[PDB]
Structure 1
Amino acid sequence: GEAPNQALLRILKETEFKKIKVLSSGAFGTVYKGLWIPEGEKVKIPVAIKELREATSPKANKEILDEAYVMASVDNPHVCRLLGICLTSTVQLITQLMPFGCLLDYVREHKDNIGSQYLLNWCVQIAKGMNYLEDRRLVHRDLAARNVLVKTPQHVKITDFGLAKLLGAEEVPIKWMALESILHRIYTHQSDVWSYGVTVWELMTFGSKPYDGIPASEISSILEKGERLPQPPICTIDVYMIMVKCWMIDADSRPKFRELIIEFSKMARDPQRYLVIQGDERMHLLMDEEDMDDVVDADEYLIP
């Protein structure tokens, strides 16, 4: 059945890293851009540091350790990298810096510069990340474009594991949830597929809000009626049909992530045949400071 989990959790000295700038604040906590110098190693690693609200209420500490636990246990090019934790008054989470931020803000900001090749490659990459999670039997439960990060315009990774669970275990983003999850709190790899559909639609509409202005309470009814998100203007029926499949009532009738990898990948070989974007053919998409000889991306920093 279940193999032992031998992932290493790395605990990092507060002195090994400098904060440098705030990236995001308010709500629950703060995320900083920083550099990490492991002890005596002659490398500087750009990182994000997730130190929650100074309020150290035990409830919050247990949630961040759940994240660390999940992120320490994954290892895939399309899933966010945990570097370690820092155990100061409140627990800091240290991840690979994803310089271009979250994919939702990135599509919203760069609408006029995003071609079909990038859209379809992101779909392929997110499907790969999700398939890997499926191999490790994790159900993410919060896939959305706000939970995908951008290392470069050509390289994205799934983030936010603070609701992830194993398939089976029993232990609220309404507009991204499969109907069986809104109704019965059932969560499967196939409910993740539903959310993949929504995430794709967010990308294809360059950041629109699904069911914009429709209160959450209505959502389950609308879905039961048989209503779904509408076809984005740039989408051929080929792409939109993939979305709609991800939104079938019968969970087992939805595609598997491995099929999504395959379909989007065929599409990515001829992107203009599948997404129709004004000016596509002409679209195109310088690091830290001065002492940057020793900088190494996390993806090139490997640990025995």
Structure 2
Amino acid sequence: GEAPNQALLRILKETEFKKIKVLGSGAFGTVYKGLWIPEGEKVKIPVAIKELREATSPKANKEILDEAYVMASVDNPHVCRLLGICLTSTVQLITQLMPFGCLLDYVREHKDNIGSQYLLNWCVQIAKGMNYLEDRRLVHRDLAARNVLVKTPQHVKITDFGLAKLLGAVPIKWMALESILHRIYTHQSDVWSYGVTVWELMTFGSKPYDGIPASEISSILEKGERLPQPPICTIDVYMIMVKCWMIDADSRPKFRELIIEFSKMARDPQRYLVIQGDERMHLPRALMDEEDMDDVVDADEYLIP
């Protein structure tokens, strides 16, 4: 029925990597900024290390290891890569460092400097990663601006596959109606979440259905109400979002189609998004933490035999 998953899972010694700083904490564990030196080879890889805080909850480790399983099985430029696992007292996940953090945080913080070309490009890249997931038959089940991470301002990646599932077996506001009423998730249900994600970027990090109970939400959608058109948005871009939020899932557009549409728009960005002083704006020694290392390589340039 299915092809063998011959992904490699790499086990890392604790000595191989060092933790430099805490990016985040709370929930299952805390995630650290870090440096990883692989074995005999002399290279330094910037990593995000995530490890568990409330002891070794057996309940909890299934979630962390499932995340690792899914992450190892994916190889795509616009999907986040897991370098390794460290089997210490606490399970540790070593992932590629996305220096500029959360895409949601980024749009909010830099809204004044984010041009249409960047926005349309991000839309394209998310569609590409999500289409890749479709090829895999993996479903994100939780696509949001919060779950997209930015390696460079010109290069984002999808993340948070912990909840990810194979096709064919809470973020209510991002969820499709079919998902709300019947707990049904498909690639197409994923597309709807993609539409909400796009809306978040177009609104520069605004919150969808702000000050609405999730209890309300199903009725509203049943009512046929949807998110408002963003100021910056032309009707062409807004229509794409609307198609994503259609009740009939097969009616909704495919990720492969979404790649096509946004790319056309990316060709002539000012026609599809109108932003004050769009022409002016520019978006990003450098290497924080360590002074010592010019042996640093990105995870992306670091490949395995």
- TM tier, smaller: over 0.9
Paired residues, number: 302
Question: 1:230 matched to which residue of 2?
Answer: 228
- C-alpha contact 2:28 2:54 (8 A) present in aligned 1: no
The 5 Å alignment of 1:206-225 reads: 206-225=204-223
Distance in 1 of aligned mates of 2:98 and 2:244 = 28
Q: TM-score, normalised by structure 1?
A: 0.98
The 5 Å alignment of 1:111-190 reads: 111-169=111-169, 172-190=170-188
Distance in 2 of aligned mates of 1:229 and 1:53 = 38
- C-alpha contact 2:52 2:91 (8 A) present in aligned 1: yes
Q: Percent identity?
A: 100
Distance in 2 of aligned mates of 1:87 and 1:30 = 16
Distance in 2 of aligned mates of 1:22 and 1:250 = 44
Distance in 2 of aligned mates of 1:189 and 1:287 = 39
Unaligned runs of at least 5 residues, structure 2:
none
Q: Deviations over 1:37-66 (max 9, x none)?
A: 011110000000011223221111000000
- C-alpha contact 2:174 2:192 (8 A) present in aligned 1: yes
- C-alpha contact 2:56 2:90 (8 A) present in aligned 1: yes
Distance in 1 of aligned mates of 2:182 and 2:245 = 16
Per-residue deviation, 1:288: 4.5
For the residue of structure 1 that corresponds to 2:279, the secondary structure is helix
Per-residue deviation, 1:106: 0.4
Distance in 2 of aligned mates of 1:53 and 1:289 = 26
Q: Deviations over 1:223-254 (max 9, x none)?
A: 10001000010000000000000000000000
- C-alpha contact 2:13 2:86 (8 A) present in aligned 1: yes
Per-residue deviation, 1:267: 0.1
Distance in 2 of aligned mates of 1:242 and 1:227 = 16
- C-alpha contact 1:104 1:203 (8 A) present in aligned 2: yes
Distance in 1 of aligned mates of 2:81 and 2:57 = 26
Distance in 2 of aligned mates of 1:231 and 1:29 = 38
For the residue of structure 1 that corresponds to 2:67, the secondary structure is helix
For the residue of structure 2 that corresponds to 1:281, the secondary structure is coil
Distance in 1 of aligned mates of 2:66 and 2:199 = 29
Distance in 1 of aligned mates of 2:137 and 2:239 = 27
Per-residue deviation, 1:292: 1.6
The 5 Å alignment of 1:57-72 reads: 57-72=57-72
- C-alpha contact 2:20 2:289 (8 A) present in aligned 1: no
Per-residue deviation, 1:199: 0.1
- C-alpha contact 1:61 1:90 (8 A) present in aligned 2: no
Per-residue deviation, 1:93: 0.6
For the residue of structure 2 that corresponds to 1:85, the secondary structure is strand
Q: Deviations over 1:266-293 (max 9, x none)?
A: 0000000000000100010045532122
- C-alpha contact 1:122 1:156 (8 A) present in aligned 2: yes
**Which region of structure 1 is more displaced relative to structure 2, 50-59 or 35-44?**
50-59
Per-residue deviation, 1:263: 0.1
Distance in 2 of aligned mates of 1:18 and 1:78 = 26
Distance in 2 of aligned mates of 1:254 and 1:90 = 43
**Which region of structure 1 is more displaced relative to structure 2, 21-30 or 180-189?**
21-30
Q: Deviations over 1:150-189 (max 9, x none)?
A: 00000000000011111102xx210000000000011000
Q: Deviations over 1:64-97 (max 9, x none)?
A: 0000000000000000010010111111110000
- C-alpha contact 1:54 1:90 (8 A) present in aligned 2: no
- C-alpha contact 1:10 1:83 (8 A) present in aligned 2: yes
- C-alpha contact 1:47 1:96 (8 A) present in aligned 2: yes
Distance in 2 of aligned mates of 1:21 and 1:54 = 19
For the residue of structure 2 that corresponds to 1:149, the secondary structure is strand
**Which region of structure 1 is more displaced relative to structure 2, 118-127 or 56-65?**
56-65
Q: Deviations over 1:14-56 (max 9, x none)?
A: 0000000000112332110000001111000000001122322
Question: 2:192 matched to which residue of 1?
Answer: 194
Unaligned runs of at least 5 residues, structure 1:
none
- C-alpha contact 1:100 1:150 (8 A) present in aligned 2: yes
Distance in 1 of aligned mates of 2:20 and 2:290 = 11
After the TM superposition, list the runs of 4 or more consecutive aligned residues in structure 1 that deviate by more than 6 angstroms: none
Q: TM-score, normalised by structure 2?
A: 0.98
Question: 2:250 matched to which residue of 1?
Answer: 252
